[model samples]
Target chain A: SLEIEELARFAVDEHNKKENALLEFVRVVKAKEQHQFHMSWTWTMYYLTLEAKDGGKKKLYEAKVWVKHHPAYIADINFKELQEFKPV
Target chain B: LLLDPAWEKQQRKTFTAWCNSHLRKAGTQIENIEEDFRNGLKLMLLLEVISGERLPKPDRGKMRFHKIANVNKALDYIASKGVKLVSIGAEEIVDGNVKMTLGMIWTIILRFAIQDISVEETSAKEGLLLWCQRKTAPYRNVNIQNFHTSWKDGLGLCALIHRHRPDLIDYSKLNKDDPIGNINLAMEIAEKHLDIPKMLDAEDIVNTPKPDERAIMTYVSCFYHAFA
Candidate 1:
């Protein structure tokens, strides 16, 4: 049973380090789709660095894409908020 | 023949709106809103053209694809030939835009991204819609027209940049991390925007989209470092 995994600092750190986006891309726990895969939704996590509309120093925006990780994935996926340790 | 399948056009348009909705929500994390507008689009156009080359490149490792020698083999059949696909000289010189290189790379990967995600379900589709709203939240008063232009010309601009500015991007230095970094940056800005292409199996072969280009100019450009 894949747990309903959310994006955590571990995942972000793993990504920042280029160790393996999938390493943190653990089994999406929840099975949203009916497909026959074990992985979660195969969404593209788009990270952006932009100027704040309020005109501040460049702020960072991290996007969590809970897309359908089909054909490729082994299971369904879900999204949750990060419970933080640090942002890598 | 330059053909126009009506339904395909409609789906394409819908996808455009869908993508725009995704980009708008990129939020404060998305640096240079205009870059999002352009880069997001640059990604899609390349997808329309290169999904076949790009898709199978990442998928060929599958047990079902043993007959496939490489991504190029898959691309050979997927690219529609003189109609959809064409070959250009190595270093085919052009004077105008240089950003197209980015578009070409992003677009090709977009194919891979879309193929990987976008499952066949109503909820995912709906999630995408909601996701678009979140993506566009940063923009104050964007309309459909501008969004449309962003989806169209923005991608073209990317193509123009890549096609023209081989000098800007050193295709050699390009690693999976380069674009992945870009995507990570986007994720920080807008958690809702799921427009990046995750490297499913792209880590192994890092040549990028241009080496596939028969065009010499594009080939040389691919090798050109963005800082050079």
Candidate 2:
């Protein structure tokens, strides 16, 4: 399980690697209580849980990171498709 | 024009008197009076001091003299109605007013530091810190105090971490880390954790583990006081 501390540290790297721009890590947590958590909070970190028939707990770490761009740049990458991102 | 000459006159007398009595005198002997002038301590601030209450804006929620040309002009504007205010005489008024001004300054600095911490922008953080310190030149001595000292140390640490220890961060688990279809997914998550709605809205955050907020505040405070 990933934690806020770990995720923030990770953001520090991406920010540095990308010409040392204004990229930042906020928080990291699971969506166990979906009702209480709203994804709109940019400073917080949350993960989504998918409903599986087996009722097994789905655990994924979502670290919330922010960049300085007002009109934020958006990118989409599939974890399974990208070999580097896949959780072994 | 909306103010009655008689009422404004009495208000000025009472306001000056109140400031003298209520505010502390120590910072007066140590700090120059111009520092008070720079802090936006005009008639409105006087009204608050005398009345011990913040005023409802007189005209459509706007200040009558938002940018008064001179500190004397603002004080004299009110003084003309009745009382001859000795602007330089009150040490406590200047002392109290300086703290209020610093409050406003740090509030803005915190907003910047919070972003800089996440954004890891050393330049912006350093720039703002320097600008704020310059703004506090009259009170430069005040920055040598305990809270100010700790704050400067904190910002230096934040800058060091952002510069040399990028490896300490792990971006893979970030909420921006979308393993699936939509970029909006990450954005939606980002919005969930945000507590502050606007920079001007005042708030006091209390959270678990004493150092959680403390550490952030120390960094924020340090950045704000870096000029000292």
Candidate 3:
């Protein structure tokens, strides 16, 4: 899941700049992909669950990233939010 | 205007920190904001640092006339940038008059640090105020109207920090009644994490009947530059 990990890292890096945060990316725990089409344009959206180190504590976060493939390969993070983790 | 010694002292310390923040980049630092700029060498270097433009070489002579000339050159460069000097002159700085010296530095801070800030087509003082209001709008109690009492409660400052970096501070834990604690927390976090100088004292903000607007503005401008 190298591609999935790369997208998770991108989401974390973008969140850092946008929010003036110092979150260190840990690893992606889960990822779900979706495809959308309109005319000749094609894009994929990924819903990712990842663990990141915020200060000294490692916590889970949810991130959404959209990647476009029609005109050119471009990746943009939609948003990132802290998630509550529970053991199953 | 009646001189408030404590307020003046706070402004002096805050302005000195603000100057050093930039002057350190040029490999020099100032201990006294008033006396250090007398010779105008550091003053010229400070201008270069803040404006990102190299000034003509300063006069190296230690004589009184040379000091005046060096100060004049620095002032001239400031005027060239379209800043009005008003009553501030090179001789006043050379004489080390505290009020004149501080006033001159304040003017410099206004023109260089605070003047260029623009948010939604507003610029300068209004621009800064608007930016603060917008950032703290989401908070329940933070209403940044002016740079004075609006910040006295300290919730506004914490709101600003939380808005930008929620991971650094928890806004919900902050209390408006604990002005000193709130102010201190914001100042400490800002200085340590955001590279902003601790310009205002919590005691001064909470105790003084009306905090100095210029001092508060000087401190707030650092936030604008840091998080804008």
For DockQ, the strongest prediction is: 2
Ranking by DockQ: 2, 1, 3
Docking quality band of candidate 1, CAPRI definitions: incorrect
DockQ scores of all models, one per candidate: 0.02, 0.03, 0.01
- Model 3 superposed RMSD (Cα): 14.7
Task: List the TM values for chain B, per candidate.
Answer: 0.22, 0.21, 0.95
Each prediction's RMSD to truth: 21.7, 20.9, 14.7
From the highest TM-score down, the ranking of the candidates is: 3, 1, 2
CA lDDT of A46 in candidate 1? 23
Provide the lDDT at B181 for model 1. 30
Model 2: runs farther than 4 Å from truth?
A1-88, B1-96, B115-228
lDDT of 1 by residue, B1-228 (tens): 012333222323223333343334432122322233232222332333433233333332333233223323333433433223334211211111223323333333333332233323423223333333333344333221221222221122122222334332222322222333322222221222223222111111122221111121121122122212
Report the Cα interface RMSD of each model, rounded to 1 decimal.
14.2, 9.8, 20.0
Tens-place lDDT per residue, model 3, B1-228, is 234886787688778888988988988889987689999899999999999998988988999999999899889999998997889989989999898888888989999999989999999999999999899887978888898889998788878888888767767666676787677767767876788867777887888777778888998888888897
lDDT of 3 by residue, A1-88 (tens): 7888988888888778768988899989898888887432356788888899989689888888876442211112222222222211
Stretch of 10 with least lDDT, candidate 2 chain A: A79-88
